[PDB]
């Protein structure tokens, strides 16, 4: 669709959090549209990456990837320009044939929404400790 | 967290369809758990995997990827029994620094699973075309 | 102009048809707008895309081209998805000249449609018979 | 079918135009016809070639394609003879496949010809702007 | 943002002319988008250029720079098709730190949209005298 | 003209700010005038400066160009005197032909001024997001 300024809700640990994410355009040589959380720096801001590919010479199956990236700072010792301690990484990738129905499609997407937050996966992402 | 049945709800193209996952098992050696849709023949059954890695002595960073896959079939292309004709793919990494705090972890598991739902993010799954 | 909705009427053999092709949004890469009729599975839909580009250091000379692809199908013996099982194809490539004239250009717009409807191009696309 | 007289009423930018095309004889060596603007001067006629080819070694599938060729000229530059300053150029090609039906034939034939005529193709051609 | 059609309003040297300008595409080499005036030749026609950077591992530092190219031509001197004779050039680079906040930006725009209508910068551009 | 105390209003992101820039003379050497914002540290101010040519004996065509250069500070780091840590850099170059006409070189100034508030270029300047 649209390159909109989108706005995430109920978020976070608590889940009352929100995240502001106005657009950044695409990038005409990757063919990856970007944006960005709306904050002051670019280098500070976390970003979200959408892509979405035709078929080709590689494998005739159509693919679309997003990722995230989450840094963190600190001022204490720079105390002037906060600078990037750590990140935070996300990437998936989805990958149906030429032959998918919407339907199919729609399902594998709701199905990662949900995964993402059943118990198991609570315990996977956030205290990192494997299906026992 | 403890391998139990999981159920995702609120699921599919309507948003109001469930799929149940009862647990396999996990796989000591892959060091992947595994669960699956209970289906009568190995191959027609839907199925997901989450895995963890902790920092080992080639990368220092820790791993968290879940995959999903989604088969289809017919039951008139062989006209006895049914064959898998598609596939649909999904799969997730995950990666954080040892230093990671646990809030950080949990903002991008939410951040994900509302960007699945963004109207941006249901035209790059659903009907493939990019943002423009 | 804008990528809107278009829509042909008046089309087919009788010429009492209609073809429906929604906007799918730009490939910044390719350089080519694309458009297709809205159909379930991509690989069966309808296709049409459109592209100029500007004279450039390879060649000065501008050169717009558009495609058509229609592809056709079969529901019988899969019954589930239907396959595709040939495609009729169709390519226009038009350049003129730099200083060339907006009314030129028009002419030869307009004349290639006349000569779609000559009765020596009914029977060199229809009955396949070459001019005798 | 027979290499008649055809004449396109009803074109140019205007609308009110016509053009009126002798017919010029075969090519039997390259097996395509070709017929051009009726006026005194072989150099300075505008020109179109139409051309089907049954399936051989290349490949076993049926292509036709017409060419446009349309000049212009100045009297001033030589003031003896005109001379073509720049030429504008169309080119089309067809291809069914071997198993192709009448219909689908003359279904991309029109669908062309609309294009050619659709608001879109209009600013791609005459103003050369892409779809946006 | 999105290339739409942008009309400028209240330009030139009287203030009472105004000029449109339609999408013409991205370069997906230059990374640069173009637009221009719609104009009868594309070479008399005026044109403006857009780019912008993204994050990557060369200069992090972002610079953009919009260009414009007005050329005009002559058409009595030999009756055959009028001929660029000269241009009119501009060309402007903005490069923000990568620590550069969204006001700061706002800022040196303004900055230089109200200093091409400050009188001093009148005599410098229009009438071409230093200031002294 | 004359180097005045030229005043930029309606300036900045809101268009409800103004920007007062003193002339601070001449380069004789490298034949630029130079004026800068009335700042309290000299290195905080902002600056720009305007340049042309004259008739002298090597090239006869005509160069024009403004440079923009507003840097920024933090001070919080050595809690002593700020430093200079990023700048915001703009440069144009007009050029125009020795037979140049008066109303063609204000058309492409005009045209510079309108572009930087067109729709187009306040998501290329301002949100660094190209033509697509």
Do not use: H, M, W
């Not at 889940?15 to 005409?28: A, D, I, M």
């Not at 030429?98 to 949900?114: G, K």
Request: charged content about 20%.
């Amino acid at each position: 669709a649209k390159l909109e300024t989108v706005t995430l809700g109920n978020i976070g640990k608590d889940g009352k959090q929100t995240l502001v994410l106005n657009p950044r355009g695409v990038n005409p040589t990757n063919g990856v549209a970007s944006l960005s959380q709306a904050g002051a720096v670019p280098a500070l801001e976390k970003r979200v990456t959408v892509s979405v590919s035709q078929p080709s010479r590689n494998r005739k199956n159509y693919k679309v990837q997003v990722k995230i990236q989450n840094p963190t700072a600190c001022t204490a010792n720079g105390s002037c320009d906060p600078s990037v301690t750590r990140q935070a990484y996300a990437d998936v990738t989805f990958s149906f044939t030429q032959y998918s129905t919407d339907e199919e499609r729609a399902f594998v997407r709701t199905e990662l929404a949900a995964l993402l937050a059943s118990p198991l996966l609570i315990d996977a992402i956030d205290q990192l400790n494997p299906a026992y």
